[PDB]
Amino acid sequence: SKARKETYSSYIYKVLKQTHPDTGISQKSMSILNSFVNDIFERIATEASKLAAYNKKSTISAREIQTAVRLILPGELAKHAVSEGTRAVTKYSSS
Amino acid sequence: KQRKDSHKEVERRRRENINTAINVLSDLLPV
Amino acid sequence: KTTLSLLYEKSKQYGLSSPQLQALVRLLCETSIIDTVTKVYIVENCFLPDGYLTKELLLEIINHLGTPTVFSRYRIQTPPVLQSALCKWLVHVNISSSIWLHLWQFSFLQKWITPLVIWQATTPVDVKPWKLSIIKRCAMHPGYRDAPGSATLILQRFQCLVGASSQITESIITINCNRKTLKSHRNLKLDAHFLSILKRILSRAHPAN
Amino acid sequence: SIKPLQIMDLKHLTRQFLNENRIILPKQTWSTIQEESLNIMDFLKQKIGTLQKQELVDSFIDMGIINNVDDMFELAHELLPLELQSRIESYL
Amino acid sequence: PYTWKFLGISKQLSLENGIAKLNQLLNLEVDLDIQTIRVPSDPDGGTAADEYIRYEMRLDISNLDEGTYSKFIFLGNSKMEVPMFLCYCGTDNRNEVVLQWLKAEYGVIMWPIKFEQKTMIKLADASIVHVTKENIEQITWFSSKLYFEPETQDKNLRQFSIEIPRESCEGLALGYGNTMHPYNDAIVPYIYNETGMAVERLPLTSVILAGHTKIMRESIVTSTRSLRNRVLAVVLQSIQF
Amino acid sequence: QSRSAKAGLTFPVGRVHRLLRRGNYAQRIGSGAPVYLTAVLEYLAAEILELAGNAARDNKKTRIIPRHLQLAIRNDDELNKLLGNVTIAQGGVLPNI
Amino acid sequence: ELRLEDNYVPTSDTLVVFKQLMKLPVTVLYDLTLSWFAKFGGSFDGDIYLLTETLDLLIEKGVRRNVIVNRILYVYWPDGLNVFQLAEIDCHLMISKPEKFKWLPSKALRGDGKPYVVKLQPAKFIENLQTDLAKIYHCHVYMFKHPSLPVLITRIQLFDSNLDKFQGKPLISRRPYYVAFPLNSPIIFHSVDKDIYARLVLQSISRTISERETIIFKPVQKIPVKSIHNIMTLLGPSRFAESMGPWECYASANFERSPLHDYKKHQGLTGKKVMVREFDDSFLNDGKEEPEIRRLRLEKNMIKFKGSANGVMSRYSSLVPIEKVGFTLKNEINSRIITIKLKFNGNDIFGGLHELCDKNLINIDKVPGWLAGENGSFSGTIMNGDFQREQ
Amino acid sequence: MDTEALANYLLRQLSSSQEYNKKLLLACGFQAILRKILLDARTRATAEGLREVYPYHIEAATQAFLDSQ
Amino acid sequence: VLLKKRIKSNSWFLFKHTIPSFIDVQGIFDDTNGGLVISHDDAYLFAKRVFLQLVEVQKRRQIFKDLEAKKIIHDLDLDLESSMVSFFVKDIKVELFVKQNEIVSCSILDDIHDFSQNNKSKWEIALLGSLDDLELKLNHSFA
């Protein structure tokens, strides 16, 4: 048997449709970008909860994630990342 | 004229066919 | 949205008593401070009675459900869709038996009036046979798509409830035999989420109503 | 050709009319009324090329449907939903 | 075409005493016939308690159809624990009006009637039989058709029928010998012997005598305008407990 | 309505939520954390795939390939710090001039 | 001359074929479309490997069937599919949902009234039939074997030209017709339709099979049968034919093992147990009962309606369910002939009768064999205790 | 299909309260004339006497309608 | 195969049987003694006829499976009664139609450089005859 495997490939392809509607993706490229988000997710979350443990505070929260991303990303990308995280969570909380 | 294929004509063919069957049977009788 | 928020925040916990319902429904038709798209939302998300609607309140509401004519040009008119929505709320919650038959004549309300008249036809004495002539007339009128099934629902109530009458049953057979709209009319919806809010409005303070 | 009106629409319309006078219709009858509705519509466009209250009452009188404007809004009452015939009465 | 529906009567009302108030209630005057009949005259059926009293009442403003022709029949007997029942035909709602008058007037309570499978077979036997002017019984044969409708898992067996033409019925009756109730006497035992099937136990729905009558769960349908007396006597004897 | 739709995000905020639960990083998780993280991931993915698409334009073909991806990631000097440890599958290596 | 070839395109309504396509799973769609592009290609630009990876990436993302169907009907082959694909979809539909289709049996006979065991090499048959049919109508013929039965199946469809139309030059389709051939048997199975086209077809098969001696088809039954499995079981070359109903165990043939089988486990030493019958009729007369005798009563009913104590195929569903049967008893009493005609209807007549026996409405010992299910699927007249199929 | 939906049909083939009333009255006229055709068809069905209004009855109704209008 | 007695005639008739339909057991029964099968000797005549007809099937199946077992032929397909049989020998493939114990027609389908029409014809002719010699002659004509 073979269990259903987690993937973000549909979302990756959709955002590529938004960017370049005429462009497709190779299978190897799609596996590569599917691995991108999981690798980033891990190296953000571990650092964020380690920072939370340094705070000796129970909850991993938005401030912890913001700090973790701005720690680990190179600064030029970090500015964009924190701005987009903040505006996204604000748009959500405005619901 | 009037176009139709329903009751009042479809039964006529059946009646006529059974009548012809009766006639051919009767033709063989002694009387 | 500030004014509507006050109505929301009050009705959600304070409810809306009969005079409060009378005052607000008057405000909806008499004032422009409430937008029409919100009027079709206030009547079914903020109108939360403490119990059954009192007779005078229903009579005062009925004045909103009228229509202008070449007689009644001077009367301010509630939009028919808002009138229909108001009837839909009335479905959620003894001359009034006679009043509500003539509400049912209106094409855009008649489907929502069927439970109201049926909930007046609750005794063998309330029903009268001549009333079915008016009901039959609309059922047979072109342009009343809901009237055939709507009338058949009322007719099916009269035939069993009356217990003693002339052969009005065959007049039911005349109404549309496909009965396509009658299936939904006999399976009306109470809008559970509105009801669930109304359950708390009936539980916060008072029993027996 | 895009002119034709559906047989089912004619069925739904004429179902109510059957109650005022019970016409009973075989299939090819339905098809012929649907087909000749195009000719009827063209003939009406000839008879009524433009719409006015005096024009429409005169056209319907010419059609033999009515005798006067009184008969005309009687027809409107018996052919329209309740609020509308009042709206037309405001127009007359 | 002539259908029928039967109701029970809880008291032996004298209908003639009250005809006028019905007439003004119905806005018309109805006829009322009186017959004292001796229907089960055969020796094994009896020679006493045969004295049923029959009433014919009609709502005929006209007689162009069953509804206008709709005629009531009351038949009763004082020795009968529930003394009387009722019959009527047609879709006319004036029947309901007269029933309402009866129940409100005589303080009598009324209910509809049902039939058992054996009741149906006995009624079918009663339908074929006729009596001559010489007080002699005779039988008219019709092509019987038993029609069942069982309930089975997954609708394995929805319905099935046993059709018996006139010749087969007459032959079975003659083989059994001179008898008066052939359907119960001969036909059903023959069916059971040939198939092991108990017609009485099986879920019977209708017994149709072609061109003569249809006997059904709730009603009788008749070729003739009226029901012969043995039918009504069988009904009354079925009312009881 | 979905959480991603309410956020305006394309990526599965609910999946990020449940994955944070699977990754046992902390016992109590703020509700804003998964949506913030999903937004960050979506931004990074969009940026890298846009760079790869422009690389494909440079290579004059209409489908992304690992060579396009490797060229983009190595050429962008900030994402080369972010993924300096990564080497791409069928990605190659960048020229000396 | 007029024989068609696989690359032609017919005309039809797109929505009907769309609804037909929606029945199929995703995987068979993938396989069919890969094969179609491999043989015919398509309007899409790219190698089959490019097509392969596009279809792949479409399926691992969990796309719905509607997307694939719309692609097939609007970009890959927008103008319409070939006749070959139209036949293939119906083939797959029949294989997937066999019970939706009806059949009739037909028996091949030669001059002396003997059965003619038809033995068929497909190539000669197909070429001869195509040449015979093409002289009268435009015909496409597709032939295949059932995946799980020893039967060759043929699909025949006829076309004609053109309501009004200009120089588009399509050929309008028509309802198809089907025929099947068991490997070694005198019997033929075909669809149930009496339009002149079906008559022309069947006549053409009868003409073309012969090749050495004349042949004619004689129908043996008047009521159709569903589910090609069932009709194969009833009349195909098999052990169950002429051993139906209570006689099924001989068709099973597992009760007896070969003689050299071991001694001590030969069933004769070990034996079995059974119930004693009662003959004085107490059935009509009339919980006061115990388990064991009731168990063996139910076993008695089982075998009387199924032929085996274990009940070789719920407890009532029969081997081949029968929907309709009409019987006619003719018996002589006092030199007078008496007719009783029983008519049954349902999903399984004999299963229902078995249920009635379990509920004790019918006496088992007085149920005849023809009523129990033997001579299965054959309505007929019983005289002198011998069944006779209706003419 | 509403009478105002018939007015909508006539609007679709033809092309605000005044025009609304005009088109509603035109829908009334169209409906009445369809009813007239069907009634004349029933009248022709009376002349022939069989069960139902077979198509040539609607046909004859249309020719009489044109011959009188 | 199972036989029952008529009610009046005091003669057998064929009621039920397991014999496949390509063996016309009813015709054999009607042929025996003019159709008036009475004696157990007549019944054994009928039974022997059907038994020999079954042995004439198993006898073909056994030899063909034996040829397959020793790799004298490659894979093959059989009809139910083993009357029409198709097989690849090494690369050549053959179609045969056999009566009881005898081959009556043959067909060779493959095309080979040395397989001229005269070569094909004489091969096809030599393949005819009794089945017992088929194994020997095929082994001899291996090449």
Swiss-Prot record, chain B:
Annotated localization: Nucleus; Mitochondrion; Chromosome, Centromere
Protein name: Centromere-binding protein 1
Summary of the function given for this chain in its UniProt record: Required for chromosome stability and methionine prototrophy. It is involved in chromosomal segregation. Binds to a highly conserved DNA sequence (5'-RTCACRTG-3'), called CDEI, found in centromeres and in several promoters. DNA-binding activity is enhanced by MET28. Required as an auxiliary factor for transcriptional activation of sulfur metabolism together with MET4 and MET28.
Organism: Saccharomyces cerevisiae (strain ATCC 204508 / S288c)
Portion of the full sequence shown: 221 to 251 of 351
Classification lineage: Eukaryota, Fungi, Dikarya, Ascomycota, Saccharomycotina
Domain bHLH residues, every copy: 2-31
Note: Present with 6890 molecules/cell in log phase SD medium.
Self-association state and partner proteins as the record states: Binds DNA as a dimer. Associates with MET4 to form a heteromeric complex which also includes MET28.
Gene this protein is translated from: CBF1
UniProtKB/Swiss-Prot annotation, chain C:
Coiled coil: none
Sorted UniProt keywords: Acetylation, Cell cycle, Cell division, Centromere, Chromosome, Kinetochore, Meiosis, Mitosis, Nucleus
Transmembrane annotation, as ranges: none
Localization of this protein: Nucleus; Chromosome, Centromere, Kinetochore
GO cellular component: kinetochore; nucleus
Main localisation: nucleus
Any GO BP annotation: attachment of spindle microtubules to kinetochore
Family: Belongs to the CENP-I/CTF3 family.
Known partners and oligomeric status: Component of the heterotrimeric kinetochore subcomplex CTF3, which consists of CTF3, MCM16 and MCM22. The CTF3 subcomplex is part of a larger constitutive centromere-associated network (CCAN) (also known as central kinetochore CTF19 complex in yeast), which is composed of at least AME1, CHL4, CNN1, CTF3, CTF19, IML3, MCM16, MCM21, MCM22, MHF1, MHF2, MIF2, NKP1, NKP2, OKP1 and WIP1. Interacts with CTF19. Interacts with CHL4.
Miscellaneous note of the record: Present with 319 molecules/cell in log phase SD medium.
Protein name stated in the entry: Inner kinetochore subunit CTF3
Organism lineage string: Eukaryota, Fungi, Dikarya, Ascomycota, Saccharomycotina
Whole-protein residues included: 25 to 245 of 733
UniProtKB/Swiss-Prot annotation, chain H:
Cell location: Nucleus; Chromosome, Centromere, Kinetochore
GO CC entries: kinetochore; nucleus
Predominant subcellular localization, coarse grouping: nucleus
Assigned keywords, A-Z: Centromere, Chromosome, Kinetochore, Nucleus
Keyword Nucleus: yes
Keyword set includes RNA-binding: no
Family: Belongs to the CENP-W/WIP1 family.
Function field: Component of the kinetochore, a multiprotein complex that assembles on centromeric DNA and attaches chromosomes to spindle microtubules, mediating chromosome segregation and sister chromatid segregation during meiosis and mitosis. Component of the inner kinetochore constitutive centromere-associated network (CCAN), which serves as a structural platform for outer kinetochore assembly.
Stated name of the protein: Inner kinetochore subunit WIP1
Organism whose genome encodes this protein: Saccharomyces cerevisiae (strain ATCC 204508 / S288c)
Gene behind the chain: WIP1
UniProtKB/Swiss-Prot annotation, chain I:
Subcellular location: Nucleus; Chromosome, Centromere, Kinetochore
Source taxon at top rank: Eukaryota
Signal sequence segment: none
Note: Present with 952 molecules/cell in log phase SD medium.
Annotated function: Component of the kinetochore, a multiprotein complex that assembles on centromeric DNA and attaches chromosomes to spindle microtubules, mediating chromosome segregation and sister chromatid segregation during meiosis and mitosis. Component of the inner kinetochore COMA complex, which connects centromere-associated proteins and the outer kinetochore. COMA interacts with other inner kinetochore proteins to form the inner kinetochore constitutive centromere-associated network (CCAN), which serves as a structural platform for outer kinetochore assembly.
Family: Belongs to the CENP-O/MCM21 family.
Assembly, per entry: Component of the heterotetrameric kinetochore subcomplex COMA, which consists of AME1, CTF19, MCM21 and OKP1. The COMA subcomplex is part of a larger constitutive centromere-associated network (CCAN) (also known as central kinetochore CTF19 complex in yeast), which is composed of at least AME1, CHL4, CNN1, CTF3, CTF19, IML3, MCM16, MCM21, MCM22, MHF1, MHF2, MIF2, NKP1, NKP2, OKP1 and WIP1. COMA binds the centromeric nucleosome-binding protein MIF2, and to the outer kinetochore MIND subcomplex.
Name by which UniProt lists this protein: Inner kinetochore subunit MCM21
Gene of this entry: MCM21
